[PDB]
Amino acid sequence: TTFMLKYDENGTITDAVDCSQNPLAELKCSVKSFEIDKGIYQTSNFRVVPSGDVVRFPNITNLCPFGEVFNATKFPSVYAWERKKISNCVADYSVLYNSTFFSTFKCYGVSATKLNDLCFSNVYADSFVVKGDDVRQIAPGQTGVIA
Amino acid sequence: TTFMLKYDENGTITDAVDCSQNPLAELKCSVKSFEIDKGIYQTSNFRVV
Amino acid sequence: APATVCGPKLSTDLIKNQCVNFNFNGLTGTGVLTPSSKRFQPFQQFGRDVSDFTDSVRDPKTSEILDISPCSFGGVSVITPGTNASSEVAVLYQDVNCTDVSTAIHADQLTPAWRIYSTGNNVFQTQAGCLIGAEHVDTSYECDIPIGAGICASYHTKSIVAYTMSLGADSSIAYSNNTIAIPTNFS
Amino acid sequence: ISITTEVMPVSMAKTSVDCNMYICGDSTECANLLLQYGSFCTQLNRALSGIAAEQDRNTREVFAQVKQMYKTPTLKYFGGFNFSQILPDPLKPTKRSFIEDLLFNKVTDLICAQKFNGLTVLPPLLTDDMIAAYTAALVSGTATAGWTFGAGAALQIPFAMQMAYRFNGIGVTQNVLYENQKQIANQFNKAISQIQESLTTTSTALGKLQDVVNQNAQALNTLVKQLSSNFGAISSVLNDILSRLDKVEAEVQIDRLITGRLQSLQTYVTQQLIRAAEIRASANLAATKMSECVLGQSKRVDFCGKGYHLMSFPQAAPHGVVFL
Amino acid sequence: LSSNFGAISSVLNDILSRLDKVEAEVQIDRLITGRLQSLQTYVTQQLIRAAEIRASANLAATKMSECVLGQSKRVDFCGKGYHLMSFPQAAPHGVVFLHVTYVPSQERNFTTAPAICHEGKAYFPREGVFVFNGTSWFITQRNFFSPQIITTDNTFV
Amino acid sequence: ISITTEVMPVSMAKTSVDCNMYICGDSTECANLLLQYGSFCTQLNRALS
């Protein structure tokens, strides 16, 4: 709890005010005084939240679309990359993330820990295989290489 | 192009404004209205190279 | 769009009740979640304010139209007589509404969270806020501590009195065809 | 004898922006980062709480000018002079003048729904009923008593004898009233009926006040559009940044967004202090005009009226005073 | 000064004694630009407040010129009632005036008219009211019952 | 009869400023970078206009 202490001139804590004890005691922590003049002041705090609704879309509730991508065999070339549309599949990136299969996981735009929670409208696995010098170079910007 | 849109109280777009149509329409996109009273207004920059 | 790639979270059901941590497809926050009458073409599933807020969403399971009013924030203004004159208990605003806060001080729904608070019993409602603590008396003396929209607080019966404002005093002077009034003594 | 609408703005909206709710709508993951800026809340919320308490002090400087208050006289016809400006009781359900009825239209239990932005408007501490109650007695006492009315208690004077001192206050002799007392009375009642026609249409009592009505409510409309801004963050919405950015990478993206939104209040709360310092200077002017054009006759010229000044009348207005 | 403007700690010599001059520069330049913004906040608060005091000093200077050095005829600028004089008293960072006012008190319900009773065309007073007490007409100054005999020098046609 | 000057300032220099020319006039990548701030093109220019 926020808690006002009155140190003395000599250095002894002689008195104190608990902040959330009274609204009168709330005022004393605001104006930093014990002798409040007659009037009207502020503390401006309000309104905590009881409940939570986490309602989201699917009634169909399919699962794990990208198991047929990463564990799938054929990946085409750089320029001939395939775009795969995913529809109505509840993805679990937490299964994807904690299993360390990947060298570069430059999770741009979002972050993997909070990627499990939110929803989307389409994901597109764009898959292609490059020479290792261009792995860092597939990023926003990085336009210098030919890949 | 910068492009103003009026949404109705219902919700269907009733009218739109191209910003670079005429210098009347630079103003409407600047002050965010259709009905302009009178006077003198702003939207500045000049001179491509 | 119609939200396609979701997460493993289970979907609860909506309530009209205030201050719900709503999570309509990654759109977190809180607020009153009352249904309303808005058009919502099927290619628009997320409505906004006059300037850029999560205002109205479609419930993606039940396809229902509902808008969000946020949780009832505002200032809190305590009203005191002088502590050397009276350390008697303060009376307070809550800058929203009577019934929204009086039904939210029956349990821990506010977060100033005063420990010992023997209130409300004298809960008024004014134009400015709600003004919990003070006793509304229909007499009218003179504005001591200004409240808002023509009412003022003071320290009378000793309690704290949320009287509406009196304007000076009433004076009865008669306009007449003939009568002038000149003074004799002067201070 | 011409009467003149002069319009002084005396107050503005008692705005009290909620610094926490403006910068970060409810998310205590943010409010730790705003807590380590120390005192840019609570010095924000004091610097325009000091405005809002002062915005009633302006209205108490102007109207709370006579001590005791005066009931509306019934026989409004005062020795030739019509007085349709003095709050008719049986006709009007509302308690305000008929000219004042023409004023509140020509601008712009009501509770605000408290939008996501964090803004609110405190109500003015003097209601429009009470402000019209003042301009009842300010018009009534000036018509009935007039002189020690301003100096102290009321000393009643028949209105022709009161005006004859005001002609004597010009310099023109007391004879010149009663020589033309009917012709003076008709020019007075003609001049008011122009005001019930001129400011019906031409938007003048709009004009000076609608500057205060717009510009104070227009800087709110700039302040709410700063929430839509990006400020070098990823998403303009504060809830999106907490929802998808690790809360250690968010503390870059939130902190780039707080310093924008906190600076947009210091842009706003500075300009509200300066507009308050203009309106206070306009209220201190109006507190002298109701002192010196209403409670008495002023001889310092082109200050009250635009000629040799006989008398004046307050009329209530939304956040303003219309003098006649 | 005891803020934390995106830094480790605002005790500024602690930042120099922990982070060594190449990573400290991140922890100080963010700490400066929040601290330097607090001065620009403060000086803006002082410029506006000086404008409010200069407006109150220019108002007090006109009271010093008019309520003190002369007698202001315009009402309720110096005093409350009719104004006689004022005594300026010094005050810490201010001026307290002592506005000596008149404020006439004891009123009398009298009766008057300008249409006086005389065979010739009626008269009008020079600073008078044509007051009438019991069975006698007089003229007085408007703010004091000083009953003068209605004569030629008081009136005109 | 002593006549006395009394000097009274009534106006100052009506100074405007192009906000976008002040911040970065030549660069349009910076003008893209300045665009993601608030209405400081407008409100800063409207304030001293």
Author numbering:
A (entry chain C): 260 to 406
B (entry chain A): 260 to 308
C (entry chain C): 506 to 662, 672 to 701
D (entry chain A): 702 to 809, 830 to 1045
E (entry chain C): 948 to 1104
F (entry chain B): 702 to 750
Quoted from the paper:
The key determinant of host specificity is the envelope-located trimeric spike (S) glycoprotein, which can be further cleaved by host proteases into an N-terminal S1 subunit and a membrane-bound C-terminal S2 region. For both MERS-CoV and SARS-CoV S proteins, the S2 subunit is mainly composed of α-helices and forms the stem region of the S protein.
By contrast, the SARS-CoV S protein remains uncleaved after thrombin cleavage, and binds its receptor Angiotensin I Converting Enzyme 2(ACE2), confirmed by gel filtration survive assay. Strikingly, for both trimers we observed two different classes of particles during three-dimensional classification, representing two conformations of the trimeric S protein with RBDs in different states (standing or lying). The atomic model was used to interpret the 3.7 Å map after being fitted into the map by domains. In the MERS-CoV or SARS-CoV S trimers, compared with the rest of the maps, the RBD region in the standing state features weaker and poorer density and has lower local resolution, which likely correlates with the flexibility for receptor binding in vivo. We hypothesis that on the cell surface one CD26 may crosslink two S trimers by binding to standing RBDs, one from each trimer, whereas the monomeric ACE2 receptor will bind to the SARS-CoV S trimer in the pattern of one receptor to one S trimer.
